[PDB]
Write an enzyme that holds these catalytic residues in place. Sequence first.
Site, PDB file in Angstrom:
ATOM      1  N   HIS A  41     -27.414  23.487  71.291  1.00 61.05           N
ATOM      2  CA  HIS A  41     -27.574  23.671  72.731  1.00 61.05           C
ATOM      3  C   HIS A  41     -28.451  22.593  73.377  1.00 61.05           C
ATOM      4  O   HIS A  41     -28.565  22.596  74.606  1.00 61.05           O
ATOM      5  CB  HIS A  41     -28.102  25.078  73.061  1.00 61.05           C
ATOM      6  CG  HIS A  41     -29.547  25.307  72.728  1.00 61.05           C
ATOM      7  ND1 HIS A  41     -29.955  26.239  71.802  1.00 61.05           N
ATOM      8  CD2 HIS A  41     -30.681  24.735  73.202  1.00 61.05           C
ATOM      9  CE1 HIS A  41     -31.275  26.243  71.726  1.00 61.05           C
ATOM     10  NE2 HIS A  41     -31.739  25.329  72.556  1.00 61.05           N
ATOM     11  N   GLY A 143     -39.730  24.955  74.388  1.00 60.08           N
ATOM     12  CA  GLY A 143     -39.791  23.732  73.622  1.00 60.08           C
ATOM     13  C   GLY A 143     -39.870  23.936  72.129  1.00 60.08           C
ATOM     14  O   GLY A 143     -39.847  22.952  71.382  1.00 60.08           O
ATOM     15  N   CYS A 145     -37.615  25.386  70.258  1.00 61.67           N
ATOM     16  CA  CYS A 145     -36.314  25.363  69.600  1.00 61.67           C
ATOM     17  C   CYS A 145     -36.243  24.225  68.589  1.00 61.67           C
ATOM     18  O   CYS A 145     -36.830  23.159  68.782  1.00 61.67           O
ATOM     19  CB  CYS A 145     -35.187  25.236  70.625  1.00 61.67           C
ATOM     20  SG  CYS A 145     -35.032  26.729  71.604  1.00 61.67           S
TER      21      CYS A 145
HETATM   22  C1  LIG Z   1     -36.091  26.605  73.069  1.00 66.98           C
HETATM   23  N1  LIG Z   1     -36.802  25.530  73.166  1.00 66.98           N
HETATM   24  C2  LIG Z   1     -36.088  27.793  74.052  1.00 66.98           C
HETATM   25  N2  LIG Z   1     -34.804  28.492  74.030  1.00 66.98           N
HETATM   26  C3  LIG Z   1     -33.680  28.212  74.689  1.00 66.98           C
HETATM   27  O1  LIG Z   1     -33.505  27.260  75.460  1.00 66.98           O
HETATM   28  C4  LIG Z   1     -32.587  29.236  74.371  1.00 66.98           C
HETATM   29  C5  LIG Z   1     -31.212  28.632  74.201  1.00 66.98           C
HETATM   30  C6  LIG Z   1     -30.384  28.928  75.431  1.00 66.98           C
HETATM   31  C7  LIG Z   1     -31.278  29.748  76.359  1.00 66.98           C
HETATM   32  N3  LIG Z   1     -32.374  30.178  75.463  1.00 66.98           N
HETATM   33  C8  LIG Z   1     -33.171  31.269  75.454  1.00 66.98           C
HETATM   34  O2  LIG Z   1     -34.006  31.369  74.544  1.00 66.98           O
HETATM   35  C9  LIG Z   1     -33.058  32.374  76.516  1.00 66.98           C
HETATM   36  N4  LIG Z   1     -32.618  33.517  75.710  1.00 66.98           N
HETATM   37  C10 LIG Z   1     -31.454  34.201  75.647  1.00 66.98           C
HETATM   38  O3  LIG Z   1     -31.292  35.135  74.869  1.00 66.98           O
HETATM   39  C11 LIG Z   1     -30.275  33.863  76.577  1.00 66.98           C
HETATM   40  F1  LIG Z   1     -29.763  32.650  76.385  1.00 66.98           F
HETATM   41  F2  LIG Z   1     -30.662  33.913  77.848  1.00 66.98           F
HETATM   42  F3  LIG Z   1     -29.261  34.719  76.398  1.00 66.98           F
HETATM   43  C12 LIG Z   1     -34.350  32.613  77.383  1.00 66.98           C
HETATM   44  C13 LIG Z   1     -34.060  33.497  78.606  1.00 66.98           C
HETATM   45  C14 LIG Z   1     -35.523  33.257  76.621  1.00 66.98           C
HETATM   46  C15 LIG Z   1     -34.896  31.269  77.892  1.00 66.98           C
HETATM   47  C16 LIG Z   1     -29.945  29.471  74.076  1.00 66.98           C
HETATM   48  C17 LIG Z   1     -29.790  30.966  73.890  1.00 66.98           C
HETATM   49  C18 LIG Z   1     -29.011  28.796  73.100  1.00 66.98           C
HETATM   50  C19 LIG Z   1     -37.095  28.885  73.711  1.00 66.98           C
HETATM   51  C20 LIG Z   1     -37.151  29.430  72.437  1.00 66.98           C
HETATM   52  N5  LIG Z   1     -38.012  30.410  72.086  1.00 66.98           N
HETATM   53  C21 LIG Z   1     -38.845  30.892  73.008  1.00 66.98           C
HETATM   54  C22 LIG Z   1     -38.842  30.425  74.305  1.00 66.98           C
HETATM   55 CL1  LIG Z   1     -39.944  31.099  75.467  1.00 66.98          CL
HETATM   56  C23 LIG Z   1     -37.956  29.421  74.666  1.00 66.98           C
END
Ligand SMILES: *C(=N)[C@@H](NC(=O)[C@@H]1[C@@H]2[C@H](CN1C(=O)[C@@H](NC(=O)C(F)(F)F)C(C)(C)C)C2(C)C)c1cncc(Cl)c1
Lengths: 306, 306
Positions: A41, A143, A145
């Site tokens: 992603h 960040g 991820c």
């Molecule tokens: C990573 N750096 C960050 N996560 C993301 O960008 C991921 C990624 C895209 C959205 N997302 C999310 O984590 C969201 N979560 C979801 O379940 C959904 F996508 F919305 F369905 C959200 C709302 C927490 C930002 C995909 C799911 C592929 C990240 C990772 N860990 C914690 C945090 Cl706070 C951010």
Amino acid sequence: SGFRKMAFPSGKVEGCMVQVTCGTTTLNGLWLDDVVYCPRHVICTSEDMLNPNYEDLLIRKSNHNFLVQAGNVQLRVIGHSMQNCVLKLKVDTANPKTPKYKFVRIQPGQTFSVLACYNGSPSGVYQCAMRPNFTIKGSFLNGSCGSVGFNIDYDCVSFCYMHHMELPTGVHAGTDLEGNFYGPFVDRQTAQAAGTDTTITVNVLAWLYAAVINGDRWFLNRFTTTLNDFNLVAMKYNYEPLTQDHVDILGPLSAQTGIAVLDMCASLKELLQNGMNGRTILGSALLEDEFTPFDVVRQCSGVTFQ
Amino acid sequence: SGFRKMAFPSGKVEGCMVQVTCGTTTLNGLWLDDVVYCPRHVICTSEDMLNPNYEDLLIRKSNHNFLVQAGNVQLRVIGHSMQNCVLKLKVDTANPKTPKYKFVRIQPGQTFSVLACYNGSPSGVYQCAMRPNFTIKGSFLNGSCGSVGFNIDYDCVSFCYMHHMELPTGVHAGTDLEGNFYGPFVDRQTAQAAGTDTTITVNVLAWLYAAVINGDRWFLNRFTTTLNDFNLVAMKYNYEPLTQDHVDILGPLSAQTGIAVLDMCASLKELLQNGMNGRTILGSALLEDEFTPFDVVRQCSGVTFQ
Ligand SMILES: *C(=N)[C@@H](NC(=O)[C@@H]1[C@@H]2[C@H](CN1C(=O)[C@@H](NC(=O)C(F)(F)F)C(C)(C)C)C2(C)C)c1cncc(Cl)c1
Ligand SMILES: *C(=N)[C@@H](NC(=O)[C@@H]1[C@@H]2[C@H](CN1C(=O)[C@@H](NC(=O)C(F)(F)F)C(C)(C)C)C2(C)C)c1cncc(Cl)c1
């Protein structure tokens, strides 16, 4: 003595962590030999993540669209491909700090260390269990991820997890290092949610054995129970079933403490029906389920890694 | 989000850990530049430790009495001296992996990461607090002596602890890296015991703020209290006093959550008088006091180290 939630020394993984940028998204990558692994992603924009066709999105990308930073040294991307939910970025330099490693997929109930990372810079290390529902209760901010989970076995790093996303309950979902999600989660923004969890019974028993090894004995008792009768109580309290294989795995701890596995099950049964009555076990007022029997043996015997 | 007991990445310390052998005693040493630091009791035999005169014991030693193993490479000892309760072993090779470092002494209530080690081989990493009584609740087995505690601030390792001994309650005592014990403990086998401890109030408050940041709010309330009236309750429940400086240190967390420090003290007061009534905070059924306000900001904002 003592019992801490103990992670593996992170050095060997720290030497693999890099920063991967594509467009305006920066996240972490894992640099092993001449390949950088990261969540696919990274190639998505805000609106791309609503419902993305990753094959379409990736064919429109170029090697030069991927900026890889290993410390203060740029890594030249010379190839890119997708493997399930991870990207493989072929780079022109093999990581000279590549440890011996494997890509392994773990079972719910097993534990691992996480090296939380931001901008390719490691921030902290901690120990997680894979929950029965295939989430992990991590600590991850924006960040993070691409931060990875792993175990170390003598000198070999078994990578088992890479972080992709946080679910609405604040728990975390990700893939193995072949890019296959743990659990029924997808790398797009749906209304996906964790789903019901259970308590890892064999781990609770392991931790009770760790408690006895460390001098907590108040929850012990002469009572015993049968496996079937214990499992009736387990089901009642949302614990998962104990199998004969679990009983076998607890053998060494049983022998070291002199407390029969089924006797300790009777203790757990009483703890579940009566609570703790204001007392604690290993500094906890809750039954802990994120230590495996292996973790307990490791910390209550003393195995190192080189 | 999420909140874990998070240690610093251990890599920079792993590169300093060596094995020090003298006679039949093997323990861990810290190799920085061309000096190896280790607990001076390495020079003691079983009967030596009953009541040792370390100056006498050391004058009878020779450079060749000290075997230093850095991995599978022997280090030639070319000088030895005693600095308080640590030994300084001068070696003919400067550690090429020496990070930027400092020797700092911490305050009770402050936290640090421990790299638990055996035979110069790191085994695990975990986070500790220095208790008000100058012990630490670690996880240490035989051979762990000389394992060190530390913090990392950008790229510089601040070593604050080296392990010497386990007290009868299963807690651990050691020195700073100048060899001065934390607390009223000595490196000889007396009947010494920890002595009464208190709960680190400012840390509990910090952890309550971490809870609010992570969505736990049930313990909140409209009530407030005065500092003096809170401290009457603190003393009652064996918590240490909260000072105005603590209130100031909690300012950033107060502002980020919108909960006044004294309001959160009122919440803590209610928690102390009523308990939790079967509920949990950040997965704990006990009030956690081994996270500092700094630790909370680190994990609820996201600072890294390089
Ligand atoms: C990573 N750096 C960050 N996560 C993301 O960008 C991921 C990624 C895209 C959205 N997302 C999310 O984590 C969201 N979560 C979801 O379940 C959904 F996508 F919305 F369905 C959200 C709302 C927490 C930002 C995909 C799911 C592929 C990240 C990772 N860990 C914690 C945090 Cl706070 C951010
Ligand atoms: C380190 N590898 C080992 N500790 C020791 O050898 C220290 C050391 C000598 C004895 N000792 C102890 O830790 C003992 N503790 C004491 O308080 C006392 F010495 F007996 F007073 C004991 C009985 C636990 C072995 C000195 C105090 C200088 C070690 C360190 N941490 C945990 C464990 Cl299990 C062993």
